[PDB]
Design an enzyme around this catalytic site. Structure first.
Site, mmCIF file in Angstrom:
data_model
loop_
_atom_site.group_PDB
_atom_site.id
_atom_site.type_symbol
_atom_site.label_atom_id
_atom_site.label_comp_id
_atom_site.label_asym_id
_atom_site.label_seq_id
_atom_site.Cartn_x
_atom_site.Cartn_y
_atom_site.Cartn_z
ATOM 1 N N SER A 197 -72.466 -18.275 -26.152
ATOM 2 C CA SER A 197 -71.527 -18.604 -25.279
ATOM 3 C C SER A 197 -70.875 -20.194 -25.341
ATOM 4 O O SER A 197 -70.542 -20.313 -26.476
ATOM 5 C CB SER A 197 -72.270 -18.647 -23.715
ATOM 6 O OG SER A 197 -71.188 -18.431 -22.773
ATOM 7 N N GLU A 324 -70.337 -8.035 -22.026
ATOM 8 C CA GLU A 324 -70.037 -9.451 -21.827
ATOM 9 C C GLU A 324 -69.871 -9.896 -20.413
ATOM 10 O O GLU A 324 -70.373 -10.917 -20.116
ATOM 11 C CB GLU A 324 -69.060 -10.028 -22.867
ATOM 12 C CG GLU A 324 -69.535 -10.084 -24.376
ATOM 13 C CD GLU A 324 -70.828 -10.907 -24.912
ATOM 14 O OE1 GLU A 324 -71.279 -11.638 -24.256
ATOM 15 O OE2 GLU A 324 -70.907 -10.966 -26.221
ATOM 16 N N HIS A 437 -74.526 -10.742 -21.262
ATOM 17 C CA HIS A 437 -73.893 -11.812 -21.940
ATOM 18 C C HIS A 437 -75.122 -12.703 -22.079
ATOM 19 O O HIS A 437 -75.946 -13.055 -20.993
ATOM 20 C CB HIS A 437 -72.886 -12.523 -21.042
ATOM 21 C CG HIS A 437 -72.593 -13.915 -21.577
ATOM 22 N ND1 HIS A 437 -71.676 -13.921 -22.824
ATOM 23 C CD2 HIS A 437 -72.504 -15.131 -21.184
ATOM 24 C CE1 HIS A 437 -71.308 -15.054 -23.260
ATOM 25 N NE2 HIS A 437 -71.548 -15.749 -22.261
HETATM 26 O O1 LIG Z 1 -77.642 -22.255 -22.032
HETATM 27 C C1 LIG Z 1 -77.652 -21.430 -21.434
HETATM 28 C C2 LIG Z 1 -77.501 -21.592 -19.782
HETATM 29 C C3 LIG Z 1 -77.361 -20.528 -18.984
HETATM 30 C C4 LIG Z 1 -76.986 -19.086 -19.537
HETATM 31 C C5 LIG Z 1 -76.836 -19.248 -21.080
HETATM 32 N N1 LIG Z 1 -77.052 -20.188 -21.503
HETATM 33 C C6 LIG Z 1 -76.306 -17.867 -21.726
HETATM 34 C C7 LIG Z 1 -76.370 -16.701 -21.046
HETATM 35 C C8 LIG Z 1 -75.977 -16.947 -19.465
HETATM 36 C C9 LIG Z 1 -76.563 -17.840 -18.598
HETATM 37 N N2 LIG Z 1 -75.722 -18.240 -17.434
HETATM 38 C C10 LIG Z 1 -74.461 -18.446 -17.271
HETATM 39 C C11 LIG Z 1 -73.655 -17.400 -16.928
HETATM 40 C C12 LIG Z 1 -74.409 -16.866 -15.364
HETATM 41 C C13 LIG Z 1 -73.249 -16.032 -14.868
HETATM 42 C C14 LIG Z 1 -72.038 -16.559 -14.424
HETATM 43 C C15 LIG Z 1 -72.155 -17.488 -13.082
HETATM 44 C C16 LIG Z 1 -70.963 -18.228 -13.081
HETATM 45 C C17 LIG Z 1 -71.433 -19.602 -12.198
HETATM 46 C C18 LIG Z 1 -71.423 -19.118 -10.761
HETATM 47 C C19 LIG Z 1 -71.853 -20.465 -9.827
HETATM 48 C C20 LIG Z 1 -71.297 -20.324 -8.487
HETATM 49 C C21 LIG Z 1 -70.010 -20.459 -8.294
HETATM 50 N N3 LIG Z 1 -69.478 -19.294 -7.589
HETATM 51 C C22 LIG Z 1 -68.158 -18.688 -7.735
HETATM 52 C C23 LIG Z 1 -67.037 -19.507 -7.274
HETATM 53 C C24 LIG Z 1 -66.358 -20.497 -8.283
HETATM 54 C C25 LIG Z 1 -65.768 -19.441 -9.680
HETATM 55 C C26 LIG Z 1 -66.675 -18.652 -9.883
HETATM 56 N N4 LIG Z 1 -66.660 -18.037 -11.191
HETATM 57 C C27 LIG Z 1 -67.455 -17.029 -11.952
HETATM 58 O O2 LIG Z 1 -67.360 -16.722 -13.070
HETATM 59 C C28 LIG Z 1 -68.715 -16.513 -11.034
HETATM 60 C C29 LIG Z 1 -68.754 -16.900 -9.630
HETATM 61 C C30 LIG Z 1 -67.874 -18.192 -9.041
#
Ligand SMILES: O=c1ccc2c([nH]1)CCC[C@@H]2NCCCCCCCCCCCCN[C@H]1CCCc2[nH]c(=O)ccc21
Ligand SMILES: O=c1ccc2c([nH]1)CCC[C@@H]2NCCCCCCCCCCCCN[C@H]1CCCc2[nH]c(=O)ccc21
Ligand SMILES: *[C@@H]1O[C@H](CO)[C@@H](O)[C@H](O)[C@H]1NC(C)=O
Ligand SMILES: *[C@@H]1O[C@H](CO)[C@@H](O)[C@H](O)[C@H]1NC(C)=O
Ligand SMILES: *[C@H]1O[C@H](CO)[C@@H](O)[C@H](O)[C@H]1NC(C)=O
Ligand SMILES: *[C@H]1O[C@H](CO)[C@@H](O)[C@H](O)[C@H]1NC(C)=O
Lengths: 528, 528
Positions: A197, A324, A437
């Site tokens: 990522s 993904e 992902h």
């Molecule tokens: O080292 C690492 C540490 C973590 C991760 C890895 N690697 C690789 C696998 C994945 C893992 N998690 C990241 C993704 C985990 C899944 C994706 C989560 C995105 C962050 C959401 C936080 C809340 C924010 N809420 C909303 C409002 C703002 C905009 C928004 N945008 C969005 O894309 C989703 C929600 C929101």
């Protein structure tokens, strides 16, 4: 003693750790930079001052200050990515796993974590490097770097918060590995950087950046590439988001000096609490503080650097997972939820596409919708959920990676491409999310070899094939031992599926959709 | 006597003709308008002055002045569409086939020829109405109308060459059938107008035009609809092409009166010889002189008339063939030829798309190309030839017809839709052309029932099913006898295949491509 190593920074004392009923050495929490605390917050890293005496490296270091996922309290699926150590701005440390007995000159792999440049820890259980270091006989290093505002707040022109310091943290750890890994038995001339990522994007960024190129030999990118739409912003947008962060914390906004001084007085959590407020658009798969195209770490735009061959020329191994986009839809699009099959209505499909391509006018949104809608069955909830999953994944990970691989291959010395599509038998996430992902990582790190974790025998076998492909590639520039994974070439564009079935070779990974994302849609948005 | 009929225009004497070893009566060449010769060239038609004495209607009339295809001298495939009678501007006549003994009040079908508004004859062998009139017991009428500059030269505002006079010729023949068909045994309250290609567009034009609506009961449209992109031009474009025709024949261009007087002095062939020079673009499936949206025959734009329900509300039966575009690619696009399989290179594919969507900027051409290209196999000559065939057919015939049927059905009293995909066993055209534009006509007219023509028994059977569907629909407003051809509805959008296999019912005829042609591409061209 085997656990005692002398480096240019001082003596370090490791600890012996058990692995698959044998043992290896681990040197945990070695500092490579001065703590970036106080007036150093937002500044470039400084090398760690050497110490006299012995540095106790028997325990994991603190994790950097970051957003903590609490969407599913106690759920292992989400909590396995959260910091599992106390957070502190004092977090610039690296970890090393060394085969026992200590090798003399063996292949080195350096892991870069990658939660969207806003999160990540080098200490997660899925990143435990002992299984890989032990099984493939490599010296395994996991580094760390500041994430979020701490690593990427960018006020170009200022030397106080120039941007990209989290990338300079990674580079400093690579400088340290290059300068000291030989004392641990690692070969400084055979270091492979690999990450997933944002970590995959970072790896591509060191391939591009002149100042990082000479510190490593080869590279592996997992579901991430430098040109990803979420991986970088212009200096003007970086500046704008820094000012908006300032505005959210009632900072004086008259000068860069005034803004930075105010931001340096806020406790870490005050910055993290408003981080998501500075995004310019209602969106999904977009993060607040990321690398800036600054004219220094990146001399020109990523695309012109790619076009002109302005990048390190070596071998690369990279790939993507089948689904993904699901992780992001679950967390940020209406109609998706963890405990239902998430069948999406036409209405939610359309608000989901708008969230996925935030930088699009109406005509562009119509082009995406037409491309992923089956018009003979437009109310099919399953097709709508899956089409949106493909949109998010194709636009944010797959097509940017395909564009990077085609541009790189024209000048590089060897490319190996994979498509990982095995859904783990013990995944705790729902079925609709598919091959998520980040879920190839556990296979790359060998977790399926530990029986208590409950993978199937064929999963243990896939993990062994993958670790041996990654290590053999790190060591020689070719994943194959001298059933063949073919070289990806400009003409043939071959790749392999990576799963529990006999290897199949295919061509032109998602070409149809990627011509849409890399050639047509951008021309469309530019004309209008 | 059975061959003697008294009409409001005078007495007419027919001739007895053999059909499938029986006989019926034919009244050929009955005039319905004054000869539009001399100072009448380009003017609206005038009704034929009644005559005393007996009009000999035993032989076919002259065909109107038109372009003659000489691309394949002697080839039956092309020559079967060419005039087979002497051409003359004195050509406004109609033909009638009447069951024997003379019916008292039977269903009437009136055929409108349709070679792109620039050609057509009511006397072609594939239009011989005896088989249909005999087999289904209907009074069959084929009319005629001026084509090319003679029927559609349009200088809006002028009463000398107002445009649409070829449509007024059709209307005058419909006025005559309405006023006199009862004397031939036909039911004036049950007349169905039907036509193919420009004839199908014409039928839809009389459904739309207030002044034509009351002259008929029901309608059948074959591979043509009023809203087709080649079927009409604005008055500004009509004017422009009339002026350019004038310029090609060295006419004084100072006034409409000056231009028209010059054009009236040219022999017919001088106009036909330069007709193709006035097209505004390098193109395919575009004809010079066609109907004009004038504010009179058409009160407003075709689309607003369709949207507001401003049209005759009755039942319609209509459909398309599988490969509508091949005829046009053969004749006008590079890389296609009659005696080869016409495998098209990428290069010819792209110059073919440019020819097919003449009114498109670069972005629009890219959108079409992306939509019809299989990117995993873009050099496949067969896929390129066929994709171009589908582009031409979808854009010029299928999608415009689908848009007309969906708009009509919202206000009409019953719609039956078909998709004709039987390739005749004795077709003389090459295999690559598939089910060609115009080749369902021979089945509608019953040619497969005559053994000397060499169709298979199953083809004779399909012809009988088709003629009985067309006649039963003409008679009742439903093709089915009281295996069902379902009604096309706004919700279900059902249609049937028409071929030698057991009837299959499907839904949403080419929806995927038609959303592209009717909704996305136009929005695209309008934004840019
Ligand atoms: O080292 C690492 C540490 C973590 C991760 C890895 N690697 C690789 C696998 C994945 C893992 N998690 C990241 C993704 C985990 C899944 C994706 C989560 C995105 C962050 C959401 C936080 C809340 C924010 N809420 C909303 C409002 C703002 C905009 C928004 N945008 C969005 O894309 C989703 C929600 C929101
Ligand atoms: O009553 C009739 C009479 C004829 C026909 C029916 N019906 C129904 C079936 C079809 C039949 N032929 C018409 C189509 C027969 C096939 C289509 C042929 C179009 C006319 C070509 C004449 C030469 C002009 N040459 C070039 C330059 C000008 C632009 C241009 N544009 C092109 O689309 C093709 C070639 C050219
Ligand atoms: C890699 O580089 C070496 C020497 O520079 C060359 O011999 C070899 O063919 C190259 N391999 C590829 C795949 O480009
Ligand atoms: C046609 O019209 C009649 C009376 O106006 C009505 O009873 C019938 O339902 C209509 N049929 C359709 C298919 O609209
Ligand atoms: C260093 O740290 C670990 C854990 O805090 C401790 O158990 C170990 O004995 C220490 N060793 C020395 C000599 O500092
Ligand atoms: C009318 O025309 C046909 C053919 O020209 C001729 O054979 C026929 O005898 C004529 N009949 C009369 C009475 O004019």
């Amino acid at each position: 003693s085997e656990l005692l190593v002398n480096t240019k920074s001082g003596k370090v004392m490791g600890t012996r750790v058990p692995v698959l009923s044998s043992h290896i050495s681990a040197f945990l929490g070695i500092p490579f930079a001065e703590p970036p605390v106080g007036n150093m917050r937002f500044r470039r890293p400084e090398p760690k001052k050497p110490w006299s005496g012995v540095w106790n490296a028997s325990t994991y270091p603190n994790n950097c200050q970051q957003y903590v996922d609490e969407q599913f309290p106690g759920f292992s699926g989400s909590e396995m990515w959260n910091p599992n150590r106390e957070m502190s701005e004092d977090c610039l440390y690296l970890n090393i796993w060394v085969p026992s007995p200590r090798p003399k000159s063996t292949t080195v792999m350096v892991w870069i974590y990658g939660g969207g440049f806003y999160s990540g820890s080098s200490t997660l259980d899925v990143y435990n490097g002992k299984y890989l270091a032990y099984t493939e006989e490599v010296v395994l290093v996991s580094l760390s770097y500041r994430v979020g505002a701490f690593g990427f707040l960018a006020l170009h022109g200022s030397q106080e918060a120039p941007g990209n310091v989290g990338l300079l943290d990674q580079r400093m750890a690579l400088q340290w590995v290059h300068d000291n890994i030989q004392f641990f038995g690692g070969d400084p001339k055979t270091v492979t950087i690999f990450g997933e990522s944002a970590g995959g994007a970072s790896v591509g960024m060191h391939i591009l950046s002149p100042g990082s190129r000479d510190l490593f030999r080869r590279a592996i990118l997992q579901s991430g590439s430098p040109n990803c739409p979420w991986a970088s912003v212009s200096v003007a947008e970086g500046r704008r988001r820094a000012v908006e962060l300032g505005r959210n914390l009632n900072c004086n906004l008259n000068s860069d000096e005034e803004l930075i001084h105010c931001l340096r007085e806020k406790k870490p959590q005050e910055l993290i609490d408003v981080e998501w407020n500075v995004l310019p658009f209602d969106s999904i798969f977009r993060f607040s503080f990321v690398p800036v195209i600054d004219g220094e770490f990146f001399p020109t735009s990523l695309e012109s650097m790619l076009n002109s061959g302005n990048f390190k020329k070596t071998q690369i191994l990279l790939g993507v997972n089948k689904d993904e986009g699901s992780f992001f839809l679950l967390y940020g699009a209406p109609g998706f939820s963890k405990d239902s099959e998430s069948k999406i209505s036409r209405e939610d499909f359309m608000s989901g596409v708008k969230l996925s391509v935030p930088h699009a006018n109406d005509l562009g949104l119509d082009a995406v919708t037409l491309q992923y809608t089956d018009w003979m069955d437009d109310n099919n909830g399953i097709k709508n959920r899956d089409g949106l999953d493909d949109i998010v994944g194709d636009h944010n990970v797959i097509c940017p990676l395909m564009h990077f691989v085609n541009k790189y291959t024209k000048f590089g010395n060897g490319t190996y491409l994979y498509f990982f599509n095995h859904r783990a038998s013990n995944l705790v996430w729902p079925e609709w999310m598919g091959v998520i992902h980040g879920y190839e990582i556990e296979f790359v790190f060998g977790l399926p070899l530990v029986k208590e974790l409950n993978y199937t025998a064929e999963e243990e076998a896939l993990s062994r094939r993958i670790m041996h492909y990654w290590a053999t590639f790190a060591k020689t520039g070719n994943p194959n031992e001298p059933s063949k994974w073919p070289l990806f070439t400009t003409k043939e564009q071959k790749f392999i599926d990576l799963n529990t079935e006999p290897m199949k070779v295919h061509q032109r990974l998602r070409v149809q959709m990627c011509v849409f994302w890399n050639q047509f849609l951008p021309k469309l948005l530019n004309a209008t």
